[PDB]
Amino acid sequence: VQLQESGGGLVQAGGSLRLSCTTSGFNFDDYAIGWFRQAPGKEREGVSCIHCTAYTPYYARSVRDRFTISSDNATNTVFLQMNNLRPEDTAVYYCVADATRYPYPEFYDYVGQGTQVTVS
Amino acid sequence: MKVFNKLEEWLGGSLFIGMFVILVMQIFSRQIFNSPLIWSEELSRLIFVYVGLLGVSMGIRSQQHIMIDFLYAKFPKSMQKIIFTIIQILILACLIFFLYFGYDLFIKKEEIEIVSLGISMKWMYLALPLITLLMLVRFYQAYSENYAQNKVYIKPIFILALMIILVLIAFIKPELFKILKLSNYFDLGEMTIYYVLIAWLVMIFFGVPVGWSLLVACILYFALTRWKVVYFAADKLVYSLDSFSLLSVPFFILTGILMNGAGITERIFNFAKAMLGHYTGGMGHVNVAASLIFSGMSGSAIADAGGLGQLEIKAMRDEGYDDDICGGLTAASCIIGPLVPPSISMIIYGVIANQSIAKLFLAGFVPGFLTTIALMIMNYFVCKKRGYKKTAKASPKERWIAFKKSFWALLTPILIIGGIFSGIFTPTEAAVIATFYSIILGGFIYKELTVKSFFKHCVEAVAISGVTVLMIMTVTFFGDIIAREQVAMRVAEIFIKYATSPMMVLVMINLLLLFLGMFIDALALQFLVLPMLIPIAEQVGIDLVFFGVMTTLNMMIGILTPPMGMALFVVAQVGKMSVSTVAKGVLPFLLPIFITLVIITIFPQIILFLPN
Ligand SMILES: CCCCCCCCCCCCCCCCCCCC(=O)O[C@H](COC(=O)CCCCCCCCCCCCCC)COP(=O)(O)OCCN
Ligand SMILES: CCCCCCCCCCCCCCCCCCCC(=O)O[C@H](COC(=O)CCCCCCCCCCCCCC)COP(=O)(O)OCCN
Ligand SMILES: CC(=O)N[C@H]1[C@H]([C@H](O)[C@H](O)CO)O[C@](O)(C(=O)O)C[C@@H]1O
Ligand code: NA
Ligand code: NA
Ligand code: NA
């Protein structure tokens, strides 16, 4: 199971970043995929996941209504569009996948390299 | 021994007195002179963790945790023993969960430091595995009694053997529990939360206590999906009690006990009976006015009933009033308690809904006055229809003697309501100052509160708050599970599909609450419907402060609906009258309460004025 991130870097307050995760090595539909966040000196926090919840994608309380997770199940890609980025979102975002479809992205078995997101 | 049988009593009482002293020292050292204490709040919360867990142990021993016996009571006695035995086994499983996953948290947090106290964040996590050892004792004793009354089926030596075997396995060879891991047998996919919900309702209607059923549901969910996460979610069982707002629950209870017991609730009644009582049916006006004045000190309707019902019914029956109205008005006027600040229902709502408690109090202030006015008008109409004789006016000297006697008491609401509104006191500091003032009143201005009596009041306040502490700390555990699975979003989609306008959503929520409160108690419902109804209300745009006031008023009606009404039972006990008579006599007074509910539902700007 391989996952590689794409996109990131530094933006201002409200830069509307677009993280991406191209993943391979499993069945895209049977595996719950998602993103979690680790701050520079804090415990990891789950952000979002698709295929985890039964009906709608799971969103964290502090990323709700301003983060949208989308699937691209033709090139096996997961996108996370972030809008209205507060200066408290400066962290590292890791793409994760897991065979158990439950909305706990910070405890998922597999994890990607991660990307730095800085908000100034 | 006996000092060990009465151990939580003298430990929780002493810790509660210490916490009270620390908080009052903080308040004085911060207000009287500018010298704030940095170590007061965190030390108080650290003490309160132990106090709450000791209260939970007392509740386990007394078997006084809230359950739903609507369908359990109807079972045949032969079939009523298997279910109770299974309930006891489930409680044992929950206690073992507590012990194991509290010891893990205690041993995993030896490096985190409490900055203000300069101590490790394990002395706060030591409480969960430690007090649980008492809970496993008090549980077994509580089981040994049940077998003496033919209420269980398993001899209480097999239960002891099972308990010690399970504890030894948990702390020696935990891997033997992997057989019970349900994820090795069932693969329900992403729709497991709806299988641990219908299995949580089956438990909730078979007589399992609410606090334990929530924990069993969490255990089932984490066993079916993935066990590895339950080590990190179990933290919610401890830091939920490390809340400064929650400290206002055992204090606002205590200030409702130190006034009935110190005789301060009779001087208020004398003042109300002197000022009012010479009107058309004025012995009901004194009832409602006494309830209104006492609602500024207490926060429970049952406390109001138990403290004023005998006096009110006696005063009303000394004037020829009928039994039905005597029992009905004194039950309908209870609900003014949990509406006017302080109130414990709104504190619980603010804890569950993460809302401000001061704003909840200010919002609920106005509906209390509206309900008081409506009850007075309905009582006046009823009395004038029945032609009750107007009582002679009190002399201008008695009306002043009663006021002069009950003068320092009347200043208690000004400390609370005028302290929170003015911003001088936070609700917890308001609770502490109110308790201190009640102690001064009953011990140094009225001279009716001893030290043994005060300690007994502290002990019973701890016991009463311990049955809500368990439900708080398990509903916090279950809420994150139910909120990551986005169940409330699906239910809200269904509700919007069936009810279009938001007003229809409010009407349907109110109808559901009215139907459920007839058979379910007002405390075994605030932890069952609110955790899922709050996110739906947030989604459909309903203000959460207004929603809290509305739900509190909707559930205070539920204690008067006579399939299951706590206020009716309390009034029947204190009035020496049948429950049926009270139930029939409260029907005329349900109408003004419904009118108040309607006019606050369709005029939300009435509620949200003082907060805004
Ligand atoms: C006369 C008849 C009377 C019948 C009496 C029945 C008695 C049994 C009742 C249940 C006992 C309490 C269970 C809940 C508390 C569990 C305590 C913690 C156990 C635990 O952590 O074990 C892990 C493994 O077990 C696990 O993986 C946990 C699986 C079990 C959790 C609970 C599952 C639901 C309950 C089962 C219901 C169905 C059966 C009912 C009989 C650790 O192992 P590790 O290696 O992962 O950790 C070590 C490395 N960190
Ligand atoms: C105070 C105690 C509780 C008060 C409320 C109930 C009072 C009366 C009790 C009787 C039961 C009433 C209905 C409640 C059902 C709860 C569980 C809903 C899930 C369910 O059965 O349907 C799911 C379908 O998902 C869907 O599309 C439907 C999802 C609906 C979710 C509703 C969850 C409510 C849980 C209760 C919270 C309190 C009330 C809040 C409104 C999964 O179907 P399945 O897996 O069973 O399929 C069976 C085939 N294999
Ligand atoms: C007596 C009982 O079982 N439940 C009652 C609870 C408890 O007194 C609780 O311990 C403190 O809220 O209080 C009420 O919610 C209240 O007056 O607001 C009414 C409810 O009927
Ligand atoms: Na009150
Ligand atoms: Na009353
Ligand atoms: Na009822």
Residue numbers in the entry:
A (entry chain B): 2 to 121
B (entry chain A): 1 to 612
What did the publication describing this PDB structure actually write?
The import of Neu5Ac by many bacteria is mediated by tripartite ATP-independent periplasmic (TRAP) transporters. The second component of the TRAP transporter is the transmembrane protein SiaQM, which is characterized by two distinct domains: the Q-domain and M-domain.
The Neu5Ac binding site has a large solvent-exposed vestibule towards the cytoplasmic side, while its periplasmic side is sealed off. We describe this as the ‘inward-facing open state’ with the substrate-bound. Neu5Ac binds to the transport domain without direct interactions with the residues in the scaffold domain. Asp521 (HP2), Ser300 (HP1), and Ser345 (helix 5) interact with the substrate through their side chains, except for one interaction between the main chain amino group of residue 301 and the C1-carboxylate oxygen of Neu5Ac. However, we observe a second lipid molecule (Lipid2) that is bound between the stator and elevator domains only in the Neu5Ac bound structure.
